[PDB]
Amino acid sequence: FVNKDQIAKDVKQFYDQALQQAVVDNAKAVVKTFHETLDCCGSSTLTALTTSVLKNNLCPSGSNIISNLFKEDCHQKIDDLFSGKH
Amino acid sequence: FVNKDQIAKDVKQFYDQALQQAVVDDDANNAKAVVKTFHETLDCCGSSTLTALTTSVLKNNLCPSGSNIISNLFKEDCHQKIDDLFSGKH
């Protein structure tokens, strides 16, 4: 069976790789899709790439977004999706 | 190395394991919260691998308010929405 924690880890790895990818040179669109779907912007583990996404308009316009930028970041949202608490 | 095609196949399977337990298991509260969070999150109700369970999914109040058999026939299913997420559409 697919295990919850395993798939969560895989998806946060996937997201982290698109964030890294979007900063250079499909990654921008995957990053924007994650941010808009999960209502987050970046990762507490990747502060510089998060600065890049805010500087490049790759985050959703919610002041709720900014107030929970790192308090409820895309790793937490991915965990919440797989836990049924998003 | 990240494998997007494996990850999307694994997400679709996770969803179908939750949906199947949600309909048969009366106290699977985590499975029902997983399916309801996928449906609210991705704007979908049911999957193409489980077309015959949509009736049941609806009756168990697992889809967002508004969903019903007719409206749901004119929407993409959850697998397609999972694929849209990993391809940067959604």
Curated annotation (Swiss-Prot), chain A:
Gene Ontology molecular-function annotations: cholesterol binding; integrin binding; MHC class II protein binding; MHC class II protein complex binding; transferrin receptor binding; virus receptor activity
Keyword Membrane on entry: yes
GO biological process, one term: macrophage fusion
Disulfide bonds: C40-C74, C41-C59
Tissue: Expressed on B cells (at protein level). Expressed in hepatocytes (at protein level). Expressed in monocytes/macrophages (at protein level). Expressed on both naive and memory CD4-positive T cells (at protein level).
Membrane topology (Extracellular): 1-85
Effect of K28E: Reduces binding to integrin
Outcome following mutation: F70A: No effect on integrin binding
Superkingdom, natural source: Eukaryota
Subunit structure: Homodimer. Part of a complex composed of CD19, CR2/CD21, CD81 and IFITM1/CD225 in the membrane of mature B cells. Interacts (via the second extracellular domain) with CD19; this interaction is initiated early during biosynthesis in the ER and enables trafficking of only properly folded CD19. Part of a complex that includes MHC class II/HLA-DR molecules and IFITM1. Interacts with IFITM1. Interacts with IFITM2 and IFITM3. Part of integrin-tetraspanin complex composed of CD9, CD81, beta-1 and beta-2 integrins in the membrane of monocyte/macrophages. (Microbial infection) Plays a critical role in HCV attachment and/or cell entry by interacting with HCV E1/E2 glycoproteins heterodimer.
Domains as described in the record: Binds cholesterol in a cavity lined by the transmembrane spans.
Disease: Immunodeficiency, common variable, 6: A primary immunodeficiency characterized by antibody deficiency, hypogammaglobulinemia, recurrent bacterial infections and an inability to mount an antibody response to antigen. The defect results from a failure of B-cell differentiation and impaired secretion of immunoglobulins; the numbers of circulating B-cells is usually in the normal range, but can be low.
Name recorded for this polypeptide: CD81 antigen
Source organism of the structure: Homo sapiens
Gene that produces this protein: CD81
Positions spanned in the full protein: 113 to 202 of 236
